[PDB]
């Protein structure tokens, strides 16, 4: 029968940061989850600058003077200045622009590795602190030149908006790093989503490759 189904995307602390809902039979609705990469970082690792931000909180940082709202008191011109020195993070609009550039540059990007649902043979992939990406080959999906894929991983993660579509959204001081998560055939065949399955996401940059941990779970009720 039909239930009110709800797919939830939660941060590393297992607090729901994004959600979508619909009336469907159980295990028949597999929508494209579009959480913001910054939403996953809310109350997350210190690098993203959102370790003290609650879920569903508004994007921090002053607006860009180039935004649709125009110039205002204390508006920032960093969104027009070069993004070279900027660190890819989510605490300001220009930092979000830098994060978008990093995730959209061919030589750079982000890669995702699976968590507790990975096979025992991958147990050498590290713990949550390592983001389950202790070494190359553990990654199962992500947007990067080597284009990783897995025949058993339950999701594939890519960039939802192209750079051009996202620059203006960033300059409007909105969440402007929307991921695109698509359930694989293996994921569609899986039923344990009620308990939640968790992945780690790390940026491919020249340095620490800082990352975070996110999760996808299912809730449902009668409708």
């Amino acid at each position: 029968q039909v239930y009110n189904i709800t797919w939830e995307v939660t941060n590393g602390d297992r607090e729901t940061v994004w959600a979508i809902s619909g009336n469907h039979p159980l295990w028949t609705w597999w929508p494209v989850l579009t959480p913001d990469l910054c939403m996953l970082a809310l109350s997350g690792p210190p690098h993203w600058g959102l370790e003290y931000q609650a879920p569903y909180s508004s994007p921090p940082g002053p607006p860009c003077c180039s935004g649709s709202s125009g110039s205002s008191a204390g508006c920032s011109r960093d969104c027009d200045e070069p993004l070279t020195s900027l660190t890819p993070r989510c605490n300001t609009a220009w930092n979000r622009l830098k994060l978008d550039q990093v995730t959209h540059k061919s030589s750079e990007g982000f890669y995702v590795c699976p968590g507790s649902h990975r096979p025992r043979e991958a147990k050498s992939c590290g713990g949550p602190d390592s983001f389950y990406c202790a070494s190359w080959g553990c990654e199962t999906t992500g947007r990067v030149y080597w284009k990783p894929s897995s025949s058993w991983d339950y999701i594939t993660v890519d960039n939802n908006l192209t750079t051009s579509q996202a620059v203006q959204v960033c300059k409007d001081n909105k969440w402007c790093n929307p991921l695109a998560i698509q359930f694989t055939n293996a994921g569609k065949q899986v039923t344990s989503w009620t308990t939640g399955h968790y992945w780690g996401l790390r940026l491919y940059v020249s340095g620490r490759d800082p990352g975070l941990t996110f999760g996808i779970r299912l809730r449902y009720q009668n409708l």
Binding site: G49, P60, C65, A73, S76, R77, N91
Partner: protein, 546 residues
Amino acid sequence: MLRRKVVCLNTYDLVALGVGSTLGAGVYVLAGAVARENAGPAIVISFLIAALASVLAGLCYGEFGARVPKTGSAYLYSYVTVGELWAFITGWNLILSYIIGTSSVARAWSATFDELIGKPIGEFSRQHMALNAPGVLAQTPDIFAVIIIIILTGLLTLGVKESAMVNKIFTCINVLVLCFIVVSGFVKGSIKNWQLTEKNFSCNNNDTNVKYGEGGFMPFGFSGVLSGAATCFYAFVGFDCIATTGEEVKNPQKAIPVGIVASLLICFIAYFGVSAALTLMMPYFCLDIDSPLPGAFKHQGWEEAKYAVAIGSLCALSTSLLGSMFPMPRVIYAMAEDGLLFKFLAKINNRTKTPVIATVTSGAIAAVMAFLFELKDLVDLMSIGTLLAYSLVAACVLVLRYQPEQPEKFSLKSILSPKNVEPSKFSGLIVNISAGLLAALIITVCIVAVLGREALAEGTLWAVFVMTGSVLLCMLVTGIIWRQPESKTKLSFKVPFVPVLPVLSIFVNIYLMMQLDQGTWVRFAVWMLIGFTIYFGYGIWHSEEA
């Protein structure tokens, strides 16, 4: 092209002269601009690099003046030691340095004075003047800077000279004001301003188009810090006056290097303290565009202190201004008397007994530059000129150490393992060639590290290959210079590590020059084109040694 010429005050007096001629617009006006635009709280680091780059240069001067019994500007030393073309380039760069320094300091003094009285002169300028070319010219011409330059040029023409007592008094007042600024920053200022985040990216004033950057201590990154250091090299200029003192010194060549180094160290300490105070009292982004230090004092509630600072700055900006003007006619007169420049510039007026025409021409050029170009543009132009001059001095120090005492085919064994105990003409030629190749290779290294910075970060094969080859071949050429014997001539002062320290000085100077803007490079290129035209059309044929 390579024709060569035939050649009291205590150390504390030299230190006072250097400090008075160095402290000025760099700290009172430009420190806030650098801490707001290029660097943040990390401007303290920016000065440090700018200090070291200066010290490396100053040390060279100590040796570069030790090889000439006569005391004079770097132009005289070059024209006595290396050659005519090299000396002309050095003197032309010094002329640019002095002229643009006069222009920039006159502008800073005019802006400070106009601020002190409510910007009435600026209001008149906006009302009645406009250049209609913000892309390359100033938003508002500085008529008062022109007036100041005219008055000071008139004073200089009528025989006004350096008053040591007045310089000491003004330097003491400025140093007292700077110490007060440091103490007030350490008292009122807080470390939290060095740890700002997006929570604090707001200004009480409702100015727009702010650059907040990353925040914290290094909002704009190490690239921003390096650009700030290149700009802050403006502040450390002015120690050449110690080498060009002219007046008799207790130690002809031992006190001069000590005085230069002590002045540079004192200036670095003062700049570090004042910049730390400025960035601790007020947020780096909040720093007032018109007057950073008074704005920070007002932000902390000590508005009255704006008077004290006004007393200090106007003193420093005065001592610095003359420090950039008194040498200005001297270099032009020296070059003209030698025939490199137009001979009419060397005619000394009988009534005044001074080079009236050279002083008037230099003053007019400085007044026009101050009228037409912004403070930052003139600052960068003088910085590039002075950096090239200092690199030339360092190259002279590197070269002369291995040349034989004056009155082609080669072999690998001779080049790498010379057996002569003292330099020969072959060794001197090897060192000259190695210096040229090392200069070219350092230019290549800096170009790839600046222009190809992102490419190097990306790891592209061509950029990495070029950088690696250039750096390793720089090391190889430095070793080649190392193996050559040094001149046995005894010198009162020597650069300790002559094979490395001059090379590092050249590299740092060229890197800082690369940090500058494209417009600065275009202005410098046109100035150098004018200088080369003058030399090759007039200088070579009318030289006094011809």
